Structure 1
Amino acid sequence: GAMAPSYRVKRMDIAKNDEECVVNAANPRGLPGDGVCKAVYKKWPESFKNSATPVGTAKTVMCGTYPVIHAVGPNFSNYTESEGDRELAAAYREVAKEVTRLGVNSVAIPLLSTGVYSGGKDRLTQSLNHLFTAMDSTDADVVIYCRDKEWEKKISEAIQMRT
């Protein structure tokens, strides 16, 4: 475990992370996809061997010895707000199981269902709070990765409001 488990946020490409494993915002079919998923495909393409997994689950595939945790959030274009909320919470609970099983001391993680799968709604708070519910009982250092400058400030605020 980490000596003093922490949350941090960085505004940069998750393919450049400084952590012991990465969470992909995957699609259910193991396709290269777009956004985060395509960045992860360019950096760790070997990790897409038999990475297909259902919505609300996570599947780990090693790229060398580097673990890529493929976490499949719901596409809110297709799910009701109610069912999508349940599947988004479930994906993050499966990420916490995988991070624990792997024995890593740090993990890089994007906010699931906040981009192309957001159904055109701002889900920063919803996705981050499900991230915290899952990861708070883990002892890995968690480093959240984002792109937007306003999102960086809001995620940083949310982390510090708990400390």
Structure 2
Amino acid sequence: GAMAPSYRVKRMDIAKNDEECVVNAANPRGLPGDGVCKAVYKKWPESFKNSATPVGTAKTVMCGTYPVIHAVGPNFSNYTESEGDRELAAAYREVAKEVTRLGVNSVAIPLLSTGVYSGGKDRLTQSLNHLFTAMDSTDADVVIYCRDKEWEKKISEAIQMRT
């Protein structure tokens, strides 16, 4: 466990994190993919051996001793808002189980389904709240990654609101 479990946000490439494991914003087929998934493939390609897993689940594959937790959010181009919301909440609960099982003291996590899976919508709040629902009961230090300056400010504000 971390001494004083916390949330933080950083605006940078999650492939350059300083945490004990990474959550990939994976596709269901374990393909190199786009966005976060492509940066994770470049940095940890060994972790895509048998990484394919269904929507709403997470599958961990070791790169050396470094855990890559492949978390598959729904593509809101394909899902209804209602079923999409259910699967996005489920993917984060599976992330919390894996982070707990691994016994890490820190984890780097992106906002699932906010990129090319967002179906053209701003899902910062929806995705972040499902992240909190899942990770609040874990004692790992959580570091949320983003790339947009206005997203960094909104994520930071949401963290500070609860403190």
| TM-score computed with the length of structure 1 as normaliser | 1.00
Matches of 1:131 and 1:15, distance apart in 2: 19
Shift of residue 9 of structure 1? 0.1
4+ long deviations beyond 6 Å: none
**Offset at residue 137 of structure 1 (A):** 0.1
Aligned twin of 2:134:
134
**How far 1:112 sits from its partner (Å)?**
0.1
**Structure 1: unaligned runs, 5 residues or longer:** none
RMSD between superposed Cα atoms in Å: 0.1
Instruction: Tell me, in whole angstroms, the C-alpha distance in 1 between the residues paired with 2:5 and 2:22.
Output: 17
Supply the distance in 2 between the matched residues of 1:82 and 1:15 (Cα, whole angstroms): 31
Rounded to whole Å, the distance in 2 between the matches of 1:143 and 1:40 is 16
**Displacement after TM superposition at 1:90 (Å):** 0.0
Shift of 1:134: 0.1
> Displacement, 1:129?
0.1
Cα deviation for residue 77 of structure 1 reads: 0.1
Q: In the alignment, what sits opposite 1:148?
A: 148
Q: What SS does the aligned partner of 2:145 have?
A: strand
Listed as ranges, the gaps of 5+ residues in structure 2 are none
| 1:78-116 deviation line (CA, Å, top 9, x unaligned) | 000000000000000000000000000000000000000
Aligned position for 1:119: 119
Q: Distance in 2 between matches of 1:48 and 1:55?
A: 16
Partner Cα distance (2:41, 2:135) in 1: 25
Shift of 1:19: 0.1
2:7 maps to 1:7: yes
1:33 aligned residue: 33
Post-superposition Cα deviations, 1:58-85, rounded to whole Å, max 9, x if no partner, equal 0000000000000000000000000000
Structure 2 residue aligned with 1:100: 100
Identity %: 100
In structure 2, what is the Cα distance between the partners aligned to 1:55 and 1:101?
20
Query: Distance in 2 between the 1:85 and 1:35 partners?
Result: 21
How far, CA to CA, are the matches of 2:57 and 2:47 in structure 1?
Answer: 16
SS in 2 for 1:62: strand
Q: Structure 2 CA distance, aligned partners of 1:12 and 1:32?
A: 20
Classify the secondary structure of the residue corresponding to 2:9.
strand
- 2:154 and 2:28 map into 1 onto residues whose CA distance is 29
Q: Provide Cα deviations, 1:139-160, integer angstroms capped at 9, x if missing partner.
A: 0000000000000000000000
CA separation in 2, counterparts of 1:28 and 1:16? Answer: 23
Alpha-carbon separation, structure 2, partners of 1:104 and 1:96 = 11
